[PDB]
């Protein structure tokens, strides 16, 4: 069947060069062209360029001329995108699109690269509890802040996964070359602090796995 497999996620520093791949299968790779589209984090779609698979001559848009190159490999039936002198604005998801019957049909996976001051730092976890004189209602809300970690992602579980409802884990935000993620839980007042509530964060990139207990005051 028609299937396009892209390379894994890449981690690069500003000024470096990354070269991702896109392997085609289920059809004659040289008979149909290959396209490339970039997608900024949570933004629109932007076209980069496309390669003549019959020949190999590539072209690029006006905003991608120069630091963007496009190659091929007829033996492996795959295409490659190489970006030179990576900038902070290059942090996005790069998609390879085919072109059998129409332009950019049958896409594939999508490799997302992050251009930042690479430093595999463990996450700093700080418990979030209401103030010592905060008002007590029927439902008490607890939190767990995860600040200053790189790279993505982090897995946040509450009470070893037994606390599933009322959990709201917000997506991470990259600022100052570091990610920051927060998570909240809503539990009845009769359960806390009468029963222990812990937020378990894990960062497999740094092999960090912490267990922070939410203590009142």
């Amino acid at each position: 069947q028609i299937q396009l497999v892209q390379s894994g996620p890449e981690l690069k520093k500003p000024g470096e060069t990354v070269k991702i791949s896109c392997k085609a299968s289920g059809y004659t790779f040289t008979d149909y062209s290959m396209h490339w589209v970039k997608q900024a984090p949570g933004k629109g779609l932007k076209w980069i360029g496309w390669i003549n698979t019959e020949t190999g001559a590539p072209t690029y848009a006006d905003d991608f001329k120069g630091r963007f190159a496009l190659s091929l490999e007829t033996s492996a039936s795959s295409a490659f995108l190489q970006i030179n002198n990576l900038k902070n604005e290059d942090t996005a998801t790069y998609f390879c699109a085919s072109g059998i019957r129409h332009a950019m049909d049958y896409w594939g996976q999508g490799t997302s690269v992050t251009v930042s001051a690479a430093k595999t730092t463990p996450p700093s976890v700080y418990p979030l509890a209401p103030g010592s004189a905060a008002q007590t209602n029927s439902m008490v809300t607890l939190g767990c802040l995860v600040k200053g970690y790189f790279p993505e992602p982090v897995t946040v579980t509450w009470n070893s996964g037994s606390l599933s409802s009322g959990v709201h884990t917000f997506p991470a935000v990259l600022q100052s070359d570091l990610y920051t993620l927060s998570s909240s839980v809503t539990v009845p007042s009769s359960t806390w602090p009468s029963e222990t509530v812990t937020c378990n964060v894990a960062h497999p990139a740094s092999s960090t796995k912490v267990d922070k207990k939410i203590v009142p005051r």
Partner: peptide
Amino acid sequence: GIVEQCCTSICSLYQLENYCN
């Protein structure tokens, strides 16, 4: 017949020079 490239997509001037002899 069963396959075309500069017809489905749009080839630029440099890609047409690669088809020359």
